[PDB]
Amino acid sequence: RNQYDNDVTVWSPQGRIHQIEYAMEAVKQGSATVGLKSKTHAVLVALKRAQSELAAHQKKILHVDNHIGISIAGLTADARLLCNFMRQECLDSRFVFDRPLPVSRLVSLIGSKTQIPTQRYGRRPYGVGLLIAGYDDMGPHIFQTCPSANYFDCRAMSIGARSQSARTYLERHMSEFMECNLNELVKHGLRALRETLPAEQDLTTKNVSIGIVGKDLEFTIYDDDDVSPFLEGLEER
Amino acid sequence: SYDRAITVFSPDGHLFQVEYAQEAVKKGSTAVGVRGRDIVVLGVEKKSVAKLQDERTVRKICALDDNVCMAFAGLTADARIVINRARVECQSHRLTVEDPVTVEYITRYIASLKQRYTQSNGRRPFGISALIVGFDFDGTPRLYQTDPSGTYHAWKANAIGRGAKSVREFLEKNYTDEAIETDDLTIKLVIKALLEVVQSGGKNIELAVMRRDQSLKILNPEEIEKYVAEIEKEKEENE
Amino acid sequence: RLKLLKLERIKDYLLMEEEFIRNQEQMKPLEEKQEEERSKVDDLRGTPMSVGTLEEIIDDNHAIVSTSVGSEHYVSILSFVDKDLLEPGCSVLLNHKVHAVIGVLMDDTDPLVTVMKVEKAPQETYADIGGLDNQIQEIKESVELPLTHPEYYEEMGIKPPKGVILYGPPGTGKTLLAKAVANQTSATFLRVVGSELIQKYLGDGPKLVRELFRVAEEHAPSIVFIDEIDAIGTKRYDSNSGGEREIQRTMLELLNQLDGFDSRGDVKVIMATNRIETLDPALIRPGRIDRKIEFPLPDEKTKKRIFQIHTSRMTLADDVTLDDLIMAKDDLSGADIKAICTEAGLMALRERRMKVTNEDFKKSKENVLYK
Amino acid sequence: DRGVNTFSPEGRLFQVEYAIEAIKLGSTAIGIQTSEGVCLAVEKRITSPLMEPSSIEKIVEIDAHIGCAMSGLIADAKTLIDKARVETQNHWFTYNETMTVESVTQAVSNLALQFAMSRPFGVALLFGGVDEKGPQLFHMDPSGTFVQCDARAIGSASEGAQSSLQEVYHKSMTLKEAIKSSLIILKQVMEEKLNATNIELATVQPGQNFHMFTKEELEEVIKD
Amino acid sequence: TYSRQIKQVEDDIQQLLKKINELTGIKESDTGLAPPALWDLAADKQTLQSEQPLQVARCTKIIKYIINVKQFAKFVVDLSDQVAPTDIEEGMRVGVDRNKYQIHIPLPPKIDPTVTMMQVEEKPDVTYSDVGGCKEQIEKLREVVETPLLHPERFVNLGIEPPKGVLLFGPPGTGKTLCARAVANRTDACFIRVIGSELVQKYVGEGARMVRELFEMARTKKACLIFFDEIDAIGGARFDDGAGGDNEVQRTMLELINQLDGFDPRGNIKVLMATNRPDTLDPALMRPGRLDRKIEFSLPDLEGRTHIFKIHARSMSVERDIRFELLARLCPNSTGAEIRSVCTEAGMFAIRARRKIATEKDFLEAVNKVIKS
Ligand SMILES: Nc1ncnc2c1ncn2[C@@H]1O[C@H](COP(=O)(O)OP(=O)(O)OP(=O)(O)O)[C@@H](O)[C@H]1O
Ligand SMILES: Nc1ncnc2c1ncn2[C@@H]1O[C@H](COP(=O)(O)OP(=O)(O)O)[C@@H](O)[C@H]1O
Ligand SMILES: [Mg+2]
Ligand SMILES: [Mg+2]
């Protein structure tokens, strides 16, 4: 791979572009975040890491609009830029039309932007992967977005390091998914995080952030204490 | 225009460019400065000049105001440009507030200039090291120094140039309020430091001194001759 | 106690051998006749037309011997041989009929040693080295007293430094100090330069490097003086252009020789470099090279000393004062001082006056100054 | 990886990594938060003698309710702190209030994110502020990752100081315990003895505003 | 006192030796037989019954057999007092006698001097427990290199492939060569160090040969541990660009890889790959089918620094008491090689103080000096 691997503007003699592959690698290096959904609820259960015992866990669930929340995995800087951008878009959409911005439209716009600096020799991708839980007129939406802009509308998705265990659990329990209460929804997300985490490590009411959106409930963030009832009621092994 | 990045961080975490710039400053002439109770002195090597070479066009020392004086070490054009920038800045500060620019403020401005020119996305960092001496409007024999990297500090004396190392150890040694009590013995310490590099008694040591809020003054060569003569008298008495 | 052991047994040797052997010599016979018998029997063992080349040795009494016609023939050796001199590639002696290994003789080697070892004791000694006492003492610590007094290190525990770099501007008596070390030390110093190991083709450079290192180890426990290497390698670059890739291979071979997997004898490496910041960060690794020494430009007093030592074999004039030359506070290496002295002498010779003059030395100063 | 902003194959921009290396090379500073306030103690790098302690400035004031400590490039800290002060005063002008420490830290980090500027800043910052949620400490790194910490250590002795902080710190102390432990660690990690001139010490309390300790109280705590 | 007694007694010994030489008289001049007697008449007779030439047998055609022999004179011969017909082999070194040319003695295969002395049968003087700061790496290496050899039935019961191929990489100087030496010393198998420079020769044809003979030698031996060093020198990026003339090294690397794992089993050969810049290494070689258990050596931590310090302090004349953990603390980001050089500097400081004790003060001075330079 000598040469052909600097800036997105260079096409490899393989139909491949490798800066994007590196951005996706950074996405994996990011921390675990799982989004899933029911007929009327979308739950993002995310593992906030602990850099140091004296440093509080890095929050990774951001409420962008009343009906839209994001879980981030990757460069916190690019995540912050993108979160600012979606907040601006939601405000502009609400201004122009007194409406909640459609989740699909929002995700398409974000994908478009993150594509834009992939065809010019002056800029870089955004090594940040987002799981978006939104509630539009059509109901709950779970979207995954990567630096490549290849947004995916998923019944349940997982991103970040160790995301494969969450993927396994979600694939196994999809049949139940779309047919469970809100508490069961959160419990399934918690089970996914438990599978992802090392067996010795357990989800305390300090490592988990739960962003829930749905009917008659703007995207609400549960951290520290708000996570306590869910973890307390959750099953063990 | 150019819009091309420069000043790339190194694998070690340093800037090859800034280290090159500081060594390029080091290779130049040597100059010392000291502060007294009301006298701030600044001597410097003349660096040789042909009998046909006017000294007026060798201005390695510049009075940026009635309280700030910079001795240069590097490239003369860079000196000229940075000096003119700083002096336009000081007149602008005079516009802003009807008070003379403090050495601290001017040093801040110079450091900001250095940072801009080292991280302005395509530039040649000024290979210069500057030494300023002033008296605040209230009056304070303040002396400041600025590295080409932009880092500046408060200094009671300094010595920059090719001999900077040895002169720095020398001045760190055998320096005290006894030496810096007043104009007396202070020029003597300066000349002793510059003769640390020997044999140039009459060929170098162009000297200036500024009294508290009085003015800056270049020391005339008959006075320099008298000072060096009495200094060598003191020497021979010592030995 | 150890002294007691050695003294006791040594006296035992003197007594045993001297007394018994002298008794037999007093009864000298029964020795000369046997010696002559044996010598003539060896001669009887065929000594016609005979030569052999040793390709290899199987074991005691059996080895393969090849002739110019490729007569590879395997033969059982004759014990009469000297034995243990049978290094592969040695010139053996073979009976005309049975090709019996009976003798070996080379008495001739590649003159690489005679080429790379010239004037082992140059005219320059530490007396000729005017100044640099600190550097001189440090290099002696590094090089000589390990060899001249292999007792202190042995008794205390550590082995001496292996590689010593001497870094400084272009001309500060690096080769002079190398020469003085050679002359003062009894070991077979080796001069080497950085402009010859850059061979035309692949493998040539590393091959001659390895051969040079092996020569150094074999012929004498001595010093190897590697001059400028910055023209070689300069660290390990991205390794794109073939020439620089090969030169990097040459440095890596140098690095293996400096400290490799197997071992290293009592051969010390002395590097001389104009610039050091650009050298391979790995090559100078403290395990391999230690005691990097500044060799800076002489100060005023060192310049006085250098002029004096250069001119010791120079009948300066009464009017000639060697202070106008110390006056110049600029770049004046020991080589520069030598050039100044030589130019003053030559100009005096040209202007026909047997005695040099202050003006002649002045003009030598201006015409030796480059910048 | 080579290039200006090229993404390294193993992730990261590799200029963030270079900046981290520069921060590690930088001098050492410590910050501790307590319900009674936040204390900052930064070792200085006074060069050869003749240096007044008011020559190197490793502590700065953000409003009368936050202090900031630096590790890295002096002028980089100067520029970042200038931005932070300007943003804080702009927010105060627009709000009739003072930012939260989280908000000022994230604003400065947001500026740091832009790599105009061709290189990341070579300074890591520690803001000890007093806001609606009491005294808090926010550590910001050149990458822009800002997090509030109970006790942080940065610079050349970053790792060792952080380990000592982990050993000594508990959820319950006061500003006095914070300062005494910080000074103990600073002396233990100092380049040379604790001369009372090679350090800068500040505190911001739910009460007295941000304050630089004067020579008297410096020597007092030192002997303590 | 003692020194003068030495000088006297060694003078006595030198006198005794020269006296022996002059009195009796033993020398060689040109060729010699110093060892008395050496009569070899029967040796001559059996040499005549022998003193055979040798060549390379080609084929045994028929099932009385027809051996074919090639040298400066071709031949077709067979039969001998020798048995094990052609030792069930054709391309050997036959070793056949003259005089009807039917009597033989098998011989090993000819191999060029390069590989002959690269065999490096010497045992480096290093052993385990002298390694600090890379406990995990040495654990990995011990496992991979020993479990397949030491009580390996446990290693086969699990039905797991035996790893084969390890590449040591890290900063310049971390004890990689030291660990390689230790493994070489401890191991009991055909060990073969390799130097990269010796594989670069005058134009094409040399490296590929020597590599192939090396490999067949290893295959002939029961079980081999090969120890390539200078892999950075031998084998690089396959790209040509301007290397169209330098393709020789790439060719040799290609043959190396093919012998490592091509269209044939490579055999019970375990490869060690020494390097310090593990990025320019060619992808084909770095393929984990040939370098299974790449190991990374990092700078030692405090405990590793202390352990290396005491290891080097194994030497005598050292202080009665030293406080090694503080020594390590004072030297952070220091290689084990730098610990070794610090011990050396402490010894040199003791000498330059004319002190036969290496004090903690000496260690501190050495640390200060090395840090400052
Ligand atoms: N773990 C260790 N234990 C003991 N000594 C060590 C250790 N690591 C390094 N050393 C010391 O460092 C030197 C080892 O150098 P060696 O040649 O083995 O290193 P390397 O990792 O192969 O790299 P390089 O060839 O770049 O030096 C010796 O001084 C050895 O004493
Ligand atoms: N003590 C000394 N230090 C440096 N140079 C000296 C000294 N004594 C004599 N010389 C002169 O220095 C010259 C040799 O310098 P050299 O070793 O060639 O420097 P380099 O190797 O850096 O070119 C000689 O001509 C010699 O006359
Ligand atoms: Mg020389
Ligand atoms: Mg090694």
Domains and CATH numbers, chain A: 2-235 (3.60.20.10)
**Look-up of token digits 């100063």:** C365
**Chain A partners of D1 at a C-beta cutoff of 8 Å?**
6
Cβ–ligand 1 distance for E337 under 6 Å, the answer yes
Contact E260, E271 (CB under 8 A): yes
Q: How is the beta sheet containing B31-35 ordered, strand by strand?
A: B157-160, B31-35, B39-44, B206-211, B216-218
* Chain E interface includes C17 (CB < 8 A): yes
Residue of the CA atom closest to atom 10 of ligand 2: C334
How many of the other CB atoms lie within 10 Å of CB of C12?
Answer: 10
Coil, strand or helix at C6: helix
Q: How distant is the Cα of D117 from the closest Cα of chain B, in angstroms? A: 6
Query: What is the maximal distance between C-alpha atoms in chain C?
Result: 84
**Mutate-to-test residue for ligand 1 from E174, E296, E312, highest number of ligand atoms within 8 A of CB:** E174
Nearest alpha-carbon partner for E352 in E360, C167, E344: E344
Cβ pair E180:C261 closer than 8 A:
yes
How far apart (Å, rounded) are the C-alpha atoms in residues C317 and C340? 15
CA of C178 to the centre of ligand 2 (A): 10
Q: Provide the phi-psi class of E333: left if phi over 0, else alpha when psi is between -120 and 50, else beta.
A: left
Contact E332, D156 (CB under 8 A): no
Do the strands C223-226 and C190-192 form a parallel or antiparallel pair, or are they unpaired?
parallel
Taking 3-state DSSP, the helix, strand and coil percentages for chain A, each rounded to the nearest 5, stand at 35, 25, 40
- Which residues between 180 and 209 in chain E have a beta carbon less than 8 angstroms from any beta carbon of chain A? none
The third-level CATH classification (topology) of the domain covering D1-224 is Glutamine Phosphoribosylpyrophosphate, subunit 1, domain 1 (3.60.20)
Atom of ligand 1 nearest to the CA of E181: 18
CA of A164: how far to CAs of A79, A133, A175, in Å?
22, 20, 18
Cβ pair B7:D119 closer than 8 A:
yes
Q: Residue C308 corresponds to which amino acid? A: Q
The range of the structural domain enclosing residue B54 comes to 1-239
* Chain B interface includes D8 (CB < 8 A): no
- Which residues between 314 and 353 in chain C have a beta carbon less than 8 angstroms from any beta carbon of chain E? none
* Chain C interface includes B7 (CB < 8 A): no
Coil, strand or helix at A115: helix
Domain definitions of chain D by residue range: 1-224
CA of C213 to the centre of ligand 3 (A): 21
User: How many domains does the structure of chain B reveal?
Assistant: 1
- Which residues between 1 and 30 in chain A have a beta carbon less than 8 angstroms from any beta carbon of chain E? 1-2
How far apart (Å, rounded) are the C-alpha atoms in residues E328 and E334? 8
Method: cryo-EM
Cβ–ligand 2 distance for C272 under 6 Å, the answer yes
* Chain A interface includes E237 (CB < 8 A): yes
Residue A31 phi/psi, 5-degree rounding, is: -95, 165
What tokens does D180 get?
A: 């005494």
What tokens does D91 get?
A: 């927010």
* Chain B interface includes C313 (CB < 8 A): no
Coil, strand or helix at C250: helix
CA of C216: how far to CAs of C191, C291, E119, E166, E243, in Å?
11, 21, 22, 34, 34
How far apart (Å, rounded) are the C-alpha atoms in residues A93 and A98? 8
CA of B193 to the centre of ligand 2 (A): 30
Cβ pair B198:C327 closer than 8 A:
no
Report whether C170 belongs to an annotated binding site. Answer: yes
Cβ pair D144:A80 closer than 8 A:
yes
Do the strands E56-60 and E67-70 form a parallel or antiparallel pair, or are they unpaired?
antiparallel
List of residues 6+ apart from B13 with CB closer than 8 A = D18, D19, D20, D21, D22, D24, D25, D122
**Chain B partners of D20 at a C-beta cutoff of 8 Å?**
13
List of residues 6+ apart from A90 with CB closer than 8 A = A64, A65, A68, A101, A106
CA of E261: how far to CAs of B201, E163, E285, in Å?
77, 13, 10
**Chain B partners of C329 at a C-beta cutoff of 8 Å?**
197-200
How far apart (Å, rounded) are the C-alpha atoms in residues E232 and B227? 65
Q: How distant is the Cα of B32 from the closest Cα of chain C, in angstroms? A: 18
CA of D204: how far to CAs of C10, C127, D185, in Å?
85, 69, 20
Coil, strand or helix at C193: coil
Residue E249 phi/psi, 5-degree rounding, is: -60, -40
Report whether E173 belongs to an annotated binding site. Answer: yes
Contact C160, C146 (CB under 8 A): yes
Cβ–ligand 2 distance for C305 under 6 Å, the answer no
Q: Do chains D and A touch (3 or more CB pairs under 8 A)?
A: yes
Q: Which residues pair with A140 in a beta bridge?
A: A135
List of residues 6+ apart from A188 with CB closer than 8 A = A36, A169, A173, A176, A177, A180
Nearest alpha-carbon partner for A42 in A77, A76, A70: A70
CA of C171 to the centre of ligand 2 (A): 6
Cα dihedral across residues E139, E145, E149, E152: positive or negative: positive
DSSP, residue by residue, chain D: --SSSPPPTTSS-SHHHHHHHHHHHSPPEEEEEETTEEEEEEE----SSS--STT---EEEEGGGEEEEEEE-HHHHHHHHHHHHHHHHHHHHHHSS---HHHHHHHHHHHHH-----S--SEEEEEEEEETTEEEEEEE-TT--EEEESEEEESTTHHHHHHHHHHH--S---HHHHHHHHHHHHHHT-SS---SSSEEEEEE-SSS-SEEPPHHHHHHHHH-
Q: Which residues pair with E9 in a beta bridge?
A: none
Nearest alpha-carbon partner for D123 in D65, D157, D81: D81
List of residues 6+ apart from A212 with CB closer than 8 A = A41, A42, A43, A44, A133, A182, A186, A219, A220, A222
Residue of the CA atom closest to atom 22 of ligand 2: C171
Cα atoms in the Cβ-side hemisphere of radius 13 Å centred on A227 = 23
End-to-end CA distance of chain A: 45
Helix E336-352 to helix C133-148 angle (10° resolution) is 100
CATH of the domain at B58: 3.60.20.10
How far apart (Å, rounded) are the C-alpha atoms in residues C340 and C318? 18
How far apart (Å, rounded) are the C-alpha atoms in residues D65 and D80? 18
Residue E237: its H or E element:
none
Q: What letters, b where the CB count within 10 A reaches 16 and e where it falls short, cover E254-281?
A: bbbbbbbeeeeebbbbbbbbbbbebebb
Q: Helices marked H in E187-244 — which ranges?
A: 206-220
Burial of C334 (0-12, 13-18, 19+ CB in 10 A): buried
List of residues 6+ apart from E367 with CB closer than 8 A = E327, E330, E331, E342, E345
Atom of ligand 1 nearest to the CA of E276: 26
**Look-up of token digits 């998914």:** A177
Cα dihedral across residues E275, E277, E282, E288: positive or negative: positive
Cβ–ligand 1 distance for E322 under 6 Å, the answer no
CA of E138 to the centre of ligand 1 (A): 13
For chain A, state the CA radius of gyration.
18
How far apart (Å, rounded) are the C-alpha atoms in residues B33 and A185? 74
DSSP, residue by residue, A176-193: TTTSS-HHHHHHHHHHHH
Residue numbers preceding breaks in chain E (C to N > 2.5 A): 63
Cα atoms in the Cβ-side hemisphere of radius 13 Å centred on D57 = 20
Resolution to 1 decimal place, in Å: 3.9
Nearest alpha-carbon partner for E117 in E14, E18, E214, E187: E214
Contact B86, B109 (CB under 8 A): yes
Coil, strand or helix at B19: helix
What tokens does C186 get?
A: 């009894």
Q: How distant is the Cα of A12 from the closest Cα of chain E, in angstroms? A: 15
* Chain C interface includes B166 (CB < 8 A): no
CA of E4: how far to CAs of C7, C13, C99, E9, E12, in Å?
12, 20, 55, 9, 12
Q: How distant is the Cα of E241 from the closest Cα of chain A, in angstroms? A: 12
Instruction: Find how far residue E40's CA is from the centre of its chain.
Output: 38
How far apart (Å, rounded) are the C-alpha atoms in residues B89 and B82? 10
Contact A73, A44 (CB under 8 A): no
Residue E166 phi/psi, 5-degree rounding, is: -135, 135
How many of the other CB atoms lie within 10 Å of CB of A55?
Answer: 20
CA of C266 to the centre of ligand 3 (A): 24
> Which of D2, D11, D162 has its CB closest to that of A52?
D162
Residue A117: its H or E element:
none
How far apart (Å, rounded) are the C-alpha atoms in residues D15 and B178? 50
Q: Residue E229 corresponds to which amino acid? A: D
Residue E51: its H or E element:
none
Cβ–ligand 2 distance for C174 under 6 Å, the answer yes
DSSP, residue by residue, D160-179: HHHHHHHHH--S---HHHHH
Helix E302-313 to helix E336-352 angle (10° resolution) is 40
Q: How is the beta sheet containing A61-65 ordered, strand by strand?
A: A61-65, A68-74, A128-136, A139-145, A152-153
How far apart (Å, rounded) are the C-alpha atoms in residues C102 and C87? 15
* Chain A interface includes E263 (CB < 8 A): no
Contact B224, B187 (CB under 8 A): no
> Which of E30, E51, E177 has its CB closest to that of C99?
E51
Which ligand sits closest to the CA of C282?
1
How far apart (Å, rounded) are the C-alpha atoms in residues D12 and C324? 62
**Mutate-to-test residue for ligand 2 from C134, C172, C179, highest number of ligand atoms within 8 A of CB:** C172
Contact E198, E324 (CB under 8 A): no
Which ligand sits closest to the CA of C166?
2
Q: How distant is the Cα of D120 from the closest Cα of chain A, in angstroms? A: 13
Residue B228 phi/psi, 5-degree rounding, is: -65, -35
Contact E176, E230 (CB under 8 A): no
Cβ pair E52:C253 closer than 8 A:
no
Nearest alpha-carbon partner for C295 in C184, C164, C189, C193: C164
Q: How distant is the Cα of A185 from the closest Cα of chain D, in angstroms? A: 30
How far apart (Å, rounded) are the C-alpha atoms in residues B186 and B42? 10
Nearest alpha-carbon partner for A160 in A21, A22, A20, A31: A31
Contact E111, E213 (CB under 8 A): yes
List of residues 6+ apart from B137 with CB closer than 8 A = B99, B100, B102
Cβ–ligand 1 distance for E341 under 6 Å, the answer no
What tokens does B7 get?
A: 């000043």
How far apart (Å, rounded) are the C-alpha atoms in residues D143 and D124? 9
**Chain C partners of E172 at a C-beta cutoff of 8 Å?**
281-282, 285
Nearest alpha-carbon partner for A35 in A84, A71, A68, A88: A71
Taking 3-state DSSP, the helix, strand and coil percentages for chain C, each rounded to the nearest 5, stand at 40, 10, 45
Report whether E95 belongs to an annotated binding site. Answer: no
Residue numbers preceding breaks in chain A (C to N > 2.5 A): none
Q: Do chains B and E touch (3 or more CB pairs under 8 A)?
A: no
CA of B141: how far to CAs of B35, B217, D111, D190, in Å?
6, 15, 38, 31
